[PDB]
Amino acid sequence: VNSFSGYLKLTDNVYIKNADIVEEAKKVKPTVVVNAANVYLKHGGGVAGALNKATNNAMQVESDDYIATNGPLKVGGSCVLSGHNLAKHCLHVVGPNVNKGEDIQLLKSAYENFNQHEVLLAPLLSAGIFGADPIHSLRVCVDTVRTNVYLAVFDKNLYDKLVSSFL
Ligand SMILES: O=C1CCc2cc(C(=O)N3C[C@H](C(=O)O)CCC34CCCC4)c(F)cc2N1
């Protein structure tokens, strides 16, 4: 039993809700919140910009130190950093950005990072400003993640389409 509330159950391990991931994280304080990161951990917009804003830019400060030490992530890769005031940890995961021409096949590799964590609060990878089809992202999520994932979908119209079209 966990403290996630109001989710629709899609499969044995995947749950979904129309919610602002920032507000969800502040309420639940999950062990892991997933950020929709880029390889530079530049959290300018989308989910990343919103999460970073909620940390008062502390996420960005920590991220800049990480990159200065380690260099960029790989598309499809991840790193674990602090969750600041939002969660114990933030798993920064880089899905392919279609508006940069990146290979959508890397979306499965991106979701594989979730399997290293028993429970996660997460957005749909490569959705929103990353330009992929969110219906496809949900399919890859369900077919790749085996741990317990609670998906927050900001857009109510998109949430209803994802539920109604889910096979
Ligand atoms: O107030 C807020 C704060 C957080 C927020 C995030 C996004 C966003 O970039 N999203 C979420 C979007 C959804 O779940 O509808 C699906 C696509 C992604 C998730 C990961 C890739 C991009 C947005 F469009 C609006 C907001 N509004």
From Swiss-Prot:
* Reactions that this protein is recorded to catalyse: Thiol-dependent hydrolysis of ester, thioester, amide, peptide and isopeptide bonds formed by the C-terminal Gly of ubiquitin (a 76-residue protein attached to proteins as an intracellular targeting signal)
Q: How does it sit in the membrane?
A: Multi-pass membrane protein
Instruction: Explain what switches its activity on or off, per the activity regulation comment.
Output: Inhibited in vitro by GRL-0617.
Q: Which residues form the Macro domain?
A: 1-167
Note the superkingdom of the native organism. Answer: Viruses
Q: What does this protein do?
A: Responsible for the cleavages located at the N-terminus of the replicase polyprotein. Participates together with nsp4 in the assembly of virally-induced cytoplasmic double-membrane vesicles necessary for viral replication. Antagonizes innate immune induction of type I interferon by blocking the phosphorylation, dimerization and subsequent nuclear translocation of host IRF3. Also prevents host NF-kappa-B signaling. In addition, PL-PRO possesses a deubiquitinating/deISGylating activity and processes both 'Lys-48'- and 'Lys-63'-linked polyubiquitin chains from cellular substrates.
According to the record's subunit comment, the protein's assembly and interactions are: May form homohexamers. Interacts with N protein.
This one is known as Papain-like protease nsp3
Biological source species? Severe acute respiratory syndrome coronavirus 2 (2019-nCoV)
Lineage, uppermost ranks? Viruses, Riboviria, Orthornavirae, Pisuviricota, Pisoniviricetes
